[PDB]
Amino acid sequence: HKSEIAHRFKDLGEEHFKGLVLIAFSQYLQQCPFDEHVKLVNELTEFAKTCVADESHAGCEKSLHTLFGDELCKVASLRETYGDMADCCEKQEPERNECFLSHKDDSPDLPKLKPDPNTLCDEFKADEKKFWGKYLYEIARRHPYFYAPELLYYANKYNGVFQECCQAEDKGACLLPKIETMREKVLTSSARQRLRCASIQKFGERALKAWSVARLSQKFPKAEFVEVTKLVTDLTKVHKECCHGDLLECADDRADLAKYICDNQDTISSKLKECCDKPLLEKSHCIAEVEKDAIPENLPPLTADFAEDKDVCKNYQEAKDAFLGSFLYEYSRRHPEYAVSVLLRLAKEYEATLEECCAKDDPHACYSTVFDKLKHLVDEPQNLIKQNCDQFEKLGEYGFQNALIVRYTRKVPQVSTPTLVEVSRSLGKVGTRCCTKPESERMPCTEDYLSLILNRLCVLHEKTPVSEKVTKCCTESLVNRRPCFSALTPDETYVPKAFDEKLFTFHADICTLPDTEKQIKKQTALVELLKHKPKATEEQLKTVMENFVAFVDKCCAADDKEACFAVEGPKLVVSTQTALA
């Protein structure tokens, strides 16, 4: 319009407008309390109404970044709570937002929420809109890049669970499974978008486009490349907007994209009917997770247009990015079975083949044989999966994570321990989420998740950079990250950490911790073990681990548990030291 804030309020409605802003403030200022953020939301919302009534009013012409940003700077506690973030205020837009974004904490160390059915069901009956708002808040301050519109959708879902389950006889039995299920979908989502924002920030839009072209051509093989391109442009803008903190424009731009998809479903896909009858937030989610359409019946083989054809360099030279998109599009729509990362490497390889072969005397002789060279890039992944799935089948989740701890602590011992523990834990879960699946689906499953988790490792590592190898693997290429990490081996350069008793002492507090935090503490100890005794043998750790559990199980049952750990602890230390020589 004439007034960006006005347009947003009109298109989105007050409800979603307030949600999205609550989120914005929650992701930028992750340590502020909910009550204060609600005040800020209402203020901005009142201003928004003024501008809708009167697009000419003072300030209404300013971008959301300017307006929202002018609000952060008016926060009295800003420097007290966030230090150098206050300095962002001394700057102009766009640098001011670039600055604010750069202080978003990807690991806030906020307390793990332990949901209590009573208190939650009380809060819900008491005030449903506020309940919803606090959920938006608690997730947004922990996931500062969470896809804002999807977060609205989850908040709705969350609420629907409470509406249903607080009526029931056993509140807890009804809802606890339901929020544990949803909570896993949310954590995945978080990661999925964090990889989107990391891509654009570290490798440019171009990298995100390529991802999308792959993803959508798989989903919509029936669509002409013209359409997929419009879809990708629109979907990329949506993400760029969310990633830069313009949540209202992200929300609006996404709803527009869903309307367009439903209006043209005849030239996009036959599997959208049920999606396109749903309410606004639910409609977009449904599209994003839609079933892949069938592949057109008689398609020409790839070799025809990308290897046997005699004008390939000519066409490539004259539209490099379109031609590579085209390839990706055509290859992608033929292979829904493939992982999006594999598809992208094939594109990256194919690209490298063209760049090299097109400078030679006889380009065709060179590029003719390219799909034999790509066949290899599909087989390489299939080895790891099989081996790692066997290792998973053998050990089960927990034991499997402990192998990964060992492998990765040897690979990258400089990395912080909490990072190693979190990442190895998530890497292990991949066994549960994938190996159980139909043998053929295994690699695509694991390749996608690994992509998500390895991204988390890079983002955590990028802040306190301490390992040249992680840095090399994280920054060299987005597509080859998984292979880069796989290929790392332990480094004999690494001087082992000096012994530190405090790392191996366990306190009676341990028996109070829930299973997950129990394993964390043990898995923390394991990491520290390999940092200090990095050449320690698989067989030796069996007994050391065996003896930690024998020790832990030995004291949590004892008459005076405090008295137990006092004497028995030092036993472990002395024992383990001797064992590891």
| Contact positions vs Ca ion (CB under 5 A) | 11, 107, 109, 246, 249, 252, 256
Closer residue to Ca ion (CB): 455 or 486: 455
- For residues 89 and 73, is the Cβ–Cβ distance under 8 A? yes
Closer residue to Ca ion (CB): 51 or 430: 51
**Is 249 one of the annotated binding-site residues?**
yes
CA angle, 549 then 550 then 556, to 5°: 80
Count CB atoms within 10 A of the CB of residue 244: 18
d(CA 240, CA 244): 6
**Is 57 one of the annotated binding-site residues?**
no
Closer residue to Ca ion (CB): 80 or 109: 109
CB of 249 to Ca ion, least distance (A): 4
**Is 1 one of the annotated binding-site residues?**
yes
**Is 4 one of the annotated binding-site residues?**
yes
**Is 37 one of the annotated binding-site residues?**
no
Cis before 221? omega within 30: no
CB of 246 to Ca ion, least distance (A): 5
Q: What does residue 222 show for φ and ψ, rounded to 5 degrees? A: -70, -20
Closer residue to Ca ion (CB): 72 or 339: 72
**Is 205 one of the annotated binding-site residues?**
no
Closer residue to Ca ion (CB): 1 or 292: 1
CB of 95 to Ca ion, least distance (A): 16
CA angle, 519 then 568 then 532, to 5°: 55
Closer residue to Ca ion (CB): 109 or 266: 109
**Is 285 one of the annotated binding-site residues?**
no
CB of 240 to Ca ion, least distance (A): 10
Q: State the residue number with the nearest CB to Ca ion.
A: 107
- For residues 50 and 42, is the Cβ–Cβ distance under 8 A? no
Residue with tokens 């799909």: 371
Closer residue to Ca ion (CB): 107 or 369: 107
**Is 87 one of the annotated binding-site residues?**
no
CB of 104 to Ca ion, least distance (A): 12
CB of 510 to Ca ion, least distance (A): 23
Q: What does residue 242 show for φ and ψ, rounded to 5 degrees? A: -60, -45
CB of 35 to Ca ion, least distance (A): 24
- For residues 184 and 157, is the Cβ–Cβ distance under 8 A? no
DSSP state of 32: S
What residue spans of 103-204 are helical by DSSP H?
Answer: 117-126, 128-140, 148-165, 171-203
d(CA 30, CA 51): 28
Cis before 94? omega within 30: yes
Question: How far is the first Cα of the chain from the last one, in angstroms, to the nearest whole number?
Answer: 73
Q: Tokens standing for 252?
A: 């609006």
CB of 576 to Ca ion, least distance (A): 29
Closer residue to Ca ion (CB): 246 or 448: 246
Q: What does residue 75 show for φ and ψ, rounded to 5 degrees? A: -75, 120
Q: Tokens standing for 453?
A: 């988790």
d(CA 372, CA 433): 31
Residue with tokens 């693997």: 473
Binding-site annotation: residue ranges: 1, 4, 11, 65, 241, 244, 246, 249, 252, 256
Binding-site annotation: residue ranges for Ca(2+): 4, 11, 241, 246, 249, 252, 256
Binding-site annotation: residue ranges for Cu cation: 1
